[PDB]
Amino acid sequence: EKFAFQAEVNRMMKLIINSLYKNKEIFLRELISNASDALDKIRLISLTDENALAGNEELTVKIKCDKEKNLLHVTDTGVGMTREELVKNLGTIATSEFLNKMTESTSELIGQFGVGFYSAFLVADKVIVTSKHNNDTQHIWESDSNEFSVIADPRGNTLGRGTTITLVLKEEASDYLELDTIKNLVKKYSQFINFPIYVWSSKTTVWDWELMN
Ligand SMILES: COC(=O)c1c(O)cc(O)c(Cl)c1CCc1nccn1Cc1ccc(Br)cc1
């Protein structure tokens, strides 16, 4: 259940963390970007499988703040990941030219190599990935960066299909819990995205999904 990061991933996480120290906001750009990709992947799959979207009729990104529990949730209803995929796609990488371009901006570089997930550790002490893939049951990937574990989700299939990224925010990254801030940041980083992105918001005092693009 417990796993070690591959060396290159450790180096990569460091390079990422040690080059975007200034513009931390990028983590949210990249998570929204990967969320879109997940939906693309499942839409494509839906072209040749009418049963592809059975676990969830919708194709969205839902973002939820939990100021109280110090958590930020980003949930796509994309393709999701199987257990094996969690262990492989988040624990290794398929690359070393990337690690040399990185040393010699660099926010555009991680975006290009599709490896911006790890930027989440810029604002989080622990990162949790809850994922339901059509071919598998719901599993959970957790890491504080020093290792990771993948477990079967005891709650069963709550996602229907897809992925929630959950960030336990750092002391200094509390700013990103304010609904003001996240609405603002998603507005910015979600224009080019063509799936709907909602933020769970407060209107006059009620709560519902609010569309941001
Ligand atoms: C898009 O794949 C995912 O399931 C997914 C998601 O739905 C939301 C996310 O925030 C993230 Cl990070 C992912 C995984 C995408 C990812 N980032 C780094 C590695 N990976 C796995 C991966 C990379 C390339 C391909 Br092609 C497939 C999976």
Numbering used by the authors: 74 to 167, 171 to 180, 187 to 286, 329 to 337
What does the paper say about this structure?
Grp94, the ER resident member of the Hsp90 family of molecular chaperones, stabilizes mutant myocilin. Compared to WT myocilin, which is secreted from TM cells, mutant myocilin variants are sequestered within the ER, where it forms a non-productive interaction with Grp94 that precludes clearance and leads to toxic accumulation. Specifically, the nucleotide binding pocket within the Grp94 N-terminal domain differs from other Hsp90 isoforms by an insertion of five amino acids. Thus, Grp94 harbors a unique, largely hydrophobic, pocket that can be exploited in inhibitor design.
